[PDB]
Design a protein around this ligand. Structure first.
Ligand SMILES: COC(=O)[C@@H]1C[C@@H](O)CN1C(=O)c1ccco1
Ligand SMILES: [Mg+2]
Ligand SMILES: [Mg+2]
Ligand SMILES: [Mg+2]
Ligand SMILES: [Mg+2]
Lengths: 194, 194
């Protein structure tokens, strides 16, 4: 019943634009919305990937590998799944493994790959694939893992046990000003609930 | 080590603005970021999202979700019930209100996240994730009455918690819908637990 009638550019940066979106409501009436989009999306099936990296090691509880970085939009440090935009021609899987290595040093193995999922669909068209990767922490490749941060990338690795993820996140939030990402919090809540 | 120096307004709508953020990178080099912010924040966070468990005896527990046309997305999305927190409303009260408006269900608060970020590489948007249980055997949730605001058009989709990820993949396969990243993350962790 509902559909887009027109998308009018309001303001375009190098990376992000704002649009006036006109669409048809399900009563047959024309309405508008203010929409955000990235300028970087080409033929990618989504803007980006986020990696759920399950670190597995003999006689250790499984950990979820997270990253902490300063996020200018937020004016502060955030704790997130490793993530980045998908390069043109790159597959979501390749992007996930590459970003995981760049941000954490770990070399993972693909487990699963989501369909494209929406980041904040009342605001933006941004989408990611959520890629689950296992990391064999008993492999020598993953023994002394060093981030390969790109230019202006400064990332800290935080590995937390899956079996206590929500409380460990709460403890980090209790101890400094930082924001946990909504996907990470959602994943930790489901762990607790299951 | 990192911090905001200045924010330059690029463009301001009624609901969203685009800024150019200047910040200090950890080497001591000054850098810029294009950032989105909402114009509506006053609040602990911009919004709430509700994780609503429909608990009925002799039935599977269900997670209650909503499907709506999302103009930024150009299509229909499957999401946790959600909306912006009114000036002077608590996140818990917003959560019960939105859940009732969007689903007709009347629920009880179980727990409340701290403010969590939506897409911190792009925006400052935050929400509280509010876990709510719904006693599906109570008379008030027998024939749930959804009270949409102006221009909201919301379908309710309840899915069993124990098979949430498979059920969501199936809807994406069959219905050409976009699942929300937070919903998908929760669903993943229900499978990944233990
Ligand atoms: C153990 O029984 C429960 O009901 C747990 C405990 C409480 O934290 C909420 N909860 C959920 O499972 C839930 C609510 C929404 C989605 O899941
Ligand atoms: Mg990244
Ligand atoms: Mg990166
Ligand atoms: Mg809503
Ligand atoms: Mg609403």
């Amino acid at each position: 019943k509902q559909y887009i009638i027109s998308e009018e550019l309001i303001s375009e940066g190098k990376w992000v634009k704002l649009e006036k979106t006109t669409y048809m409501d399900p009563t047959g009436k024309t309405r508008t919305w203010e929409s955000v989009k990235r300028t970087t999306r080409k033929e990618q099936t989504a803007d980006g990937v986020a990696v759920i990296p399950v670190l597995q090691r003999t006689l250790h509880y499984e950990c979820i590998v997270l990253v902490k970085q300063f996020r200018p939009p937020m004016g502060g440090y955030c704790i997130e799944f490793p993530a980045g935009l998908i390069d043109d021609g790159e597959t979501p899987e390749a992007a996930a493994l590459r970003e995981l290595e760049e941000e954490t040093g770990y070399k993972g193995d693909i487990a699963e790959c989501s369909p494209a999922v929406c980041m904040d669909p009342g605001l933006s068209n941004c989408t990611i694939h959520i890629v689950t990767v296992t990391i064999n922490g008993d492999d020598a490749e993953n023994a002394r893992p060093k981030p390969k941060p790109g230019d202006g990338e400064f990332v800290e690795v935080i590995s937390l046990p899956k079996n206590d993820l929500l409380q460990r996140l709460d403890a980090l939030v209790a101890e400094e000003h930082l924001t946990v990402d909504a996907r990470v919090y959602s994943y930790a809540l489901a762990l607790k609930h299951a």
